[PDB]
Structure 1
Amino acid sequence: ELQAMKDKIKENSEKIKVNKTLPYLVSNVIELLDVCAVIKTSTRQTYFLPVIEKLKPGDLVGVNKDSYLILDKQIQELVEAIVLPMNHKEKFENLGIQGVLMYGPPGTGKTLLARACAFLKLAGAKLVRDAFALSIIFIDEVKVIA
Structure 2
Amino acid sequence: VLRVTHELQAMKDKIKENSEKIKVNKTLPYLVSNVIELLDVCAVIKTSTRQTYFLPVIGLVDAEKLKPGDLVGVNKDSYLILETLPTTEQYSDIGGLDKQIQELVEAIVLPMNHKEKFENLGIQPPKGVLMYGPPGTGKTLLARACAAQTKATFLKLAGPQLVQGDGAKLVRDAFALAKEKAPSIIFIDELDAIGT
TM-score (norm 2): 0.48
Give the superposition deviation at 1:93. 0.9
Unaligned runs of 5+ in 1: none
More strand by share: 1
Q: Answer yes or no: is the 8 Å Cα contact 2:45–2:53 preserved in 1.
A: yes
Counterparts of 1:126 and 1:19, CA distance in 2: 22
Task: Out of 21-30 and 118-127, give the one that drifted further.
Answer: 118-127
Q: Answer yes or no: is the 8 Å Cα contact 1:128–1:139 preserved in 2.
A: no
Within a 5 Å distance, the mapping from 1:20-99 to structure 2 comes to: 24-43=30-49, 45-52=51-58, 53-70=64-81, 71-98=97-124, 99=128
Distance 1:50 1:28, change over 3 A: same
Q: Answer yes or no: is the 8 Å Cα contact 1:82–1:143 preserved in 2.
A: no
**Count of paired positions:** 146
Task: Please report the RMSD computed on the Cα atoms of aligned residues, expressed in angstroms.
Answer: 5.5
Q: Answer yes or no: is the 8 Å Cα contact 1:28–1:41 preserved in 2.
A: yes
Task: Out of 1-10 and 104-113, give the one that drifted further.
Answer: 1-10
For residues 1-27 of structure 1, what are the alpha-carbon distances to aligned partners after superposition, in whole Å with 9 as ceiling and x for unaligned?
689779968986896579976873334
Task: Out of 20-29 and 119-128, give the one that drifted further.
Answer: 119-128
Give the superposition deviation at 1:76. 2.8
Q: Answer yes or no: is the 8 Å Cα contact 2:28–2:76 preserved in 1.
A: no
Give the superposition deviation at 1:45. 4.2
Counterparts of 2:186 and 2:172, CA distance in 1: 11
Counterparts of 1:144 and 1:89, CA distance in 2: 33
Give the superposition deviation at 1:34. 2.3
- Partner SS state of residue 31, structure 1: strand
Unaligned runs of 5+ in 2: 1-6, 59-63, 82-96, 147-152, 159-166, 178-183
- Partner SS state of residue 94, structure 1: helix
- Partner SS state of residue 36, structure 2: coil
- Partner SS state of residue 170, structure 2: helix
Cross-structure match for 2:154? 119
Give the superposition deviation at 1:66. 3.0
Q: Answer yes or no: is the 8 Å Cα contact 1:137–1:144 preserved in 2.
A: no
TM-score (norm 1): 0.60
